Amino acid sequence: GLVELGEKAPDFTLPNQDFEPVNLYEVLKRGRPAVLIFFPAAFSPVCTKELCTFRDKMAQLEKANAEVLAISVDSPWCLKKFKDENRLAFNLLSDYNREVIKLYNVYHEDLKGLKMVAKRAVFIVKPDGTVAYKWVTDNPLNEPDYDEVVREANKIAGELV
Amino acid sequence: LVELGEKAPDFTLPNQDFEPVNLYEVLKRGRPAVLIFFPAAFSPVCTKELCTFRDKMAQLEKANAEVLAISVDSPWCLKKFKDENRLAFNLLSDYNREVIKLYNVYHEDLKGLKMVAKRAVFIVKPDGTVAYKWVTDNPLNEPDYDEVVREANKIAGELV
Numbered sequence A: 001g002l003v004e005l006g007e008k009a010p011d012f013t014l015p016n017q018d019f020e021p022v023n024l025y026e027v028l029k030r031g032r033p034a035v036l037i038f039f040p041a042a043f044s045p046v047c048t049k050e051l052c053t054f055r056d057k058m059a060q061l062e063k064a065n066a067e068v069l070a071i072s073v074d075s076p077w078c079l080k081k082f083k084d085e086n087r088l089a090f091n092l093l094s095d096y097n098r099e100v101i102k103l104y105n106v107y108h109e110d111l112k113g114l115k116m117v118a119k120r121a122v123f124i125v126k127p128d129g130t131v132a133y134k135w136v137t138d139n140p141l142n143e144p145d146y147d148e149v150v151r152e153a154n155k156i157a158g159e160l161v
Numbered sequence B: 001l002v003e004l005g006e007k008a009p010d011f012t013l014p015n016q017d018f019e020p021v022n023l024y025e026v027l028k029r030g031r032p033a034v035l036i037f038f039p040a041a042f043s044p045v046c047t048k049e050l051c052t053f054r055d056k057m058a059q060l061e062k063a064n065a066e067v068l069a070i071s072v073d074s075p076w077c078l079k080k081f082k083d084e085n086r087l088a089f090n091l092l093s094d095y096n097r098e099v100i101k102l103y104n105v106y107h108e109d110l111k112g113l114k115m116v117a118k119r120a121v122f123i124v125k126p127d128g129t130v131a132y133k134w135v136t137d138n139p140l141n142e143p144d145y146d147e148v149v150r151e152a153n154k155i156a157g158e159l160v
Helices: A024-028 A045-056 A076-086 A099-103 A145-158 B025-026 B057-062 B075-084 B098-100 B143-158
Strands: A013-015 A021-023 A034-038 A067-072 A091-094 A107-111 A113-117 A121-126 A131-136 B012-014 B020-022 B032-038 B068-072 B090-093 B106-110 B113-117 B119-124 B128-137
Touching: A021 A024, A024 A034, A024 A067, A024 B075, A034 A045, A045 A067, A067 B020, A121 A145, A131 A145, A145 B143, B012 B090, B020 B025, B025 B032, B025 B113, B032 B143, B057 B068, B057 B143, B075 B090, B098 B119, B119 B143, B128 B143
Parallel strands: A034 A067, A067 A091, B032 B068, B068 B090
Antiparallel strands: A013 A021, A034 A121, A107 A113, A121 A131, B012 B020, B032 B119, B106 B113, B119 B128
């Protein structure tokens, strides 16, 4: 149940904010790396800061032509409002039933009395499905190193040529 | 599990600001409590003819009673919902699905989303007595807020 570096990323299907099924392997078949951003909660201070920082660096991410998939346990309805309010130009996926967080081993048993919330984590998956980058924090106040995520995603894109 | 005329089981849940709210502390203030369960903040409501995202829970502010709105959404999502709709009452998060099991007001599966609150209304007297109960198996079916205000004002009136 551990998603190690160089290992194949487990496939999953999740509804996005508009209730459309998004499958990781179908995304990878497009030929661009996938950036999986797990976050504890829509509308929380750090998650809003995190998704807005990735939005402000979208142009740098679109150079690498990378697919960004942000994931939390919030409903697609909550995720739709959160995407619209922040002008997020990528898909937010609902792991409402806790299947994906258990699969990627990125969950908090308890956060502020809320059970089984996603940990803040970032994975970069190559088109062949191998995990090329894994960042997981036990403290949700910590933010990923954005510039390094964008740099590593761009490095995969350039290596694909 | 929870019948009209019997004692409403007590519970404590965090509100939109993470402040714990206990049902019996609320009742102790001496006014009935109106419990409104709802599946999801920012989700649509439908009649036989109109489907909208316009939530009408704000009409319950008129009731001479304390209003407690409950969904399984996080307190952060509930804070956004409370602020958008300018709701003057507490929104409680049953994130861990304990209150919906207790009041037996849950959908096993709604559009692939497991253990979601049914649309429901309980009017509880200060002594703990369930003086009004309305439950629907249709997650889109909003209660008649004017009838809830009507029953709540009546229940608060009978109070001796």
